[PDB]
From Swiss-Prot, chain A:
Induction: By heat shock. Transcriptionally regulated by CtsR. Up-regulated by heavy metals such as Cu(2+) and Cd(2+), but Zn(2+) and Co(2+) have no effect. Forms part of an operon with ctsR, mcsA and mcsB. It comes from the Bacteria. This is ATP-dependent Clp protease ATP-binding subunit ClpC. Belongs to the ClpA/ClpB family. ClpC subfamily. Required for growth at high temperatures, probably by acting as a chaperone during heat shock and targeting heat-denatured proteins for degradation by ClpP. Required for biofilm formation. May act as a chaperone regulating CtsR activity. May interact with ClpP. It comes from Staphylococcus aureus (strain NCTC 8325 / PS 47).
Swiss-Prot record, chain B:
The chain holds residues 206 to 273 of 818 of the full protein. Signal peptide: none annotated. ATP binds at G3, E4, P5, G6, V7, G8, K9, T10. Belongs to the ClpA/ClpB family. ClpC subfamily. This is ATP-dependent Clp protease ATP-binding subunit ClpC. Required for growth at high temperatures, probably by acting as a chaperone during heat shock and targeting heat-denatured proteins for degradation by ClpP. Required for biofilm formation. May act as a chaperone regulating CtsR activity. Induction: By heat shock. Transcriptionally regulated by CtsR. Up-regulated by heavy metals such as Cu(2+) and Cd(2+), but Zn(2+) and Co(2+) have no effect. Forms part of an operon with ctsR, mcsA and mcsB. It comes from the Bacteria. May interact with ClpP.
Length: 68, 68
């Protein structure tokens, strides 16, 4: 999928990942994830790597907030 | 875990297990069992057709049922 299609996919899948990670994912985060994954990640393909970037960022922020 | 030989990847897994035991991980992994599987053990004694697939399927079903 193209960049715009990948952004649409991420916006569609945002609710499930927000529910799992108990956080709120911004649109600018979606755009940045797609752009950076397309530019820098090379061995993988757009939708999967964008999803991975969003999911790992959500996991990192959740772990940082929860830890106490 | 990717690295050169003798860097401590198995040590990383053991440290994760010790963190589980000492309970310094998030709530989502508080009572998880870290079980080390060797594929040579899984393939042992598997002369007839379908036996390895059967063993692996039973293992996966047990993992799904346990959930921890
Ligand atoms: Mg090792």
């Amino acid at each position: 999928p193209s960049v715009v299609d990948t952004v649409a996919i991420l916006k569609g899948l945002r609710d499930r990942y927000e529910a799992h990670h108990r956080i709120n994912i911004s649109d600018e985060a979606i755009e940045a994830a797609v752009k950076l994954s397309n530019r820098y990640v090379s061995d993988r393909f757009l939708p999967d790597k964008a999803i991975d970037l969003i999911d790992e960022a959500s996991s990192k922020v959740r772990l940082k907030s929860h830890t106490t | 875990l990717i690295g050169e030989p003798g860097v401590g990847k198995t040590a990383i897994a053991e440290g994760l297990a010790q963190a589980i035991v000492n309970n310094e991980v998030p709530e989502t992994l508080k009572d998880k069992r870290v079980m080390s599987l060797d594929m040579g053990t899984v393939v042992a004694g598997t002369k007839y057709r379908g036996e390895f697939e059967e063993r692996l399927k039973k293992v996966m079903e047990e993992i799904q049922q346990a959930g921890n």
